[PDB]
Amino acid sequence: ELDQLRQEAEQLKNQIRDARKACADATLSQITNNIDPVGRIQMRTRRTLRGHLAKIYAMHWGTDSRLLVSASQDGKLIIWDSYTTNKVHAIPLRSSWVMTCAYAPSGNYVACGGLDNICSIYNLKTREGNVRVSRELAGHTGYLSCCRFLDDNQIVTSSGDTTCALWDIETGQQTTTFTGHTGDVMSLSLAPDTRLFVSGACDASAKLWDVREGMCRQTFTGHESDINAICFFPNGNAFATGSDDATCRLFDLRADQELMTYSHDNIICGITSVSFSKSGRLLLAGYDDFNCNVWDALKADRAGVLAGHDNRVSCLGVTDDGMAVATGSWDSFLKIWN
Amino acid sequence: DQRNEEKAQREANKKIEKQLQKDKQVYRATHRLLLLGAGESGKSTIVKQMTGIFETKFQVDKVNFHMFDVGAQRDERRKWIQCFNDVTAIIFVVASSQTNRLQEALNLFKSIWNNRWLRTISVILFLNKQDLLAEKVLAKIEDYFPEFARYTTPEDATPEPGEDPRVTRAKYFIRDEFLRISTASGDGRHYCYPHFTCSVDTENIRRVFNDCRDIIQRMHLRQYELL
């Protein structure tokens, strides 16, 4: 029974591998050789946000490119004003162990989650003046790794029980469940059109899901160790990942394989976060060796370094107008670069 | 429209910062601990002496303590174990013993000790079931740990009254297994405090209090470059 099933799985794997092999016409580096290099990129710290008592685990930029939320170990959730460095809100959490936070695309809400297996949604439009828990979504059987709003009533979570889900915040139930991975899921990224999303798990693989169908579309399995970060290309046709083997990679949805690899022999630390530029020419990655690296996405050449943190870099994001980069770290500081 | 809203921003920032200074005052006066150990070890009775994660509050001599027990998670520790990298101490509970359980206990201790983000945490080690060990020995360790036949009780052993050395040798053998794993590495940056507890005991909180006091004293000595 299991013998012929394993044989047929191996046969299908070989058929898929040969199908991809018959498609590698020419390497991406072979095509972008004549393109003039970007040149050195210098970025300076413009702001420094100083209010967290302990490590910082996550952050998210508002769609207005001005405000941002951040989470920390002390049990706080602080909303900043990056232009003027003024704290707007500071929400105290019931559980001190939070691993993620998201900021709604409309600006009316903010989410968080962590080791308590629960996603809490906070209503910022305080009719009476105070911020209070709108909804507590409890259906997972493992910690929460990431969460991203679709709109004011839908949110996608990824968990440490090898499962992602889609929620109806009004009812508090699970609309759909995405069950393909065989390890903890550590990140997710929503498409520009928000009809698909990709996840990264602790089995060195990534998958492409259909939010409305509820099924896996494609699987990308280049990496060697656990995947920690994931992000789409601005086009929506490619994405980049970052894993524990001190490497980043670029995958394409239409060719169904890998295109580029961003690594060096002197880099032996894992990547904690990736992000793209507004045009998709830069690729920013934060490492465990206390600093960030800027990559030329088309030629795989380093273009700069963002070294301003004393402990490891845990999160990284780029505004929606592409004007600034915010970097959080375990030394309890955020820094805006430009 | 401009200056008045700037004033409002500054007022909100000031109020937030005042609440944050009060919170910071509260946050530094509490010591957080992580309680580990397998199910058969006997963590439940230890907790009763004092959902993805649990929590217990107790204070000794007007000093506040937190203790966190992992609830409904999976058996893959390599990811959620990094959240506990700046707790005061880890309390590792072991039962003196169906496969080889002591080897899994020793392997988990070795993994915790050498982890990159847990190289500054000290472990308060409880060797729990000292009565089951008393009966089992006087009724085998050589067939799972073949170094036992060449083990002799340390000179500085403290035997309980009315106890035959037959169990004292096994007690100190297991303690020395954990302690010899401990000193193989660590650069002297963290320490292990092993204790021989029992199923029922009235002084586990006192032992944890003394061990945490020593841990914090050594940490302060080390942060002034005096150690």
């Epitope: 065989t182 602790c202 060697e224 160790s225 656990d226 083997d245 032996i268 | 058996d75 390599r78």
Partner: nanobody, 126 residues
Amino acid sequence: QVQLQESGGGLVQPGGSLRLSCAASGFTFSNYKMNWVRQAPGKGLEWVSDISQSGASISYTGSVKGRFTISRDNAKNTLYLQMNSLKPEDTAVYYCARCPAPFTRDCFDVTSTTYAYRGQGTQVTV
């Protein structure tokens, strides 16, 4: 893609010998510490031995120490185990498990019910 494939095993007489092999693909064999784990009938998985990146540090379980040997070939990308002077209680399925991350000295989840970086196992019977 990470793939570990065990070979060797079968039925041997008590007091006999065996030699397992595990061929690794999809990663650099030279950056990872390698393990061997086993699962007896009706029981859970149990760690058996491991070998360092270079091949210097080696450890064994108490019950197999003296008989079993673990060795690796970084050039040929293969992991070995020599199981001589067997006993009936040594019947189980043996897996080669790799530590999750490179350049590390700890290995957490090799002896776990659903681990992503080990093979399918070879039945060894006595």
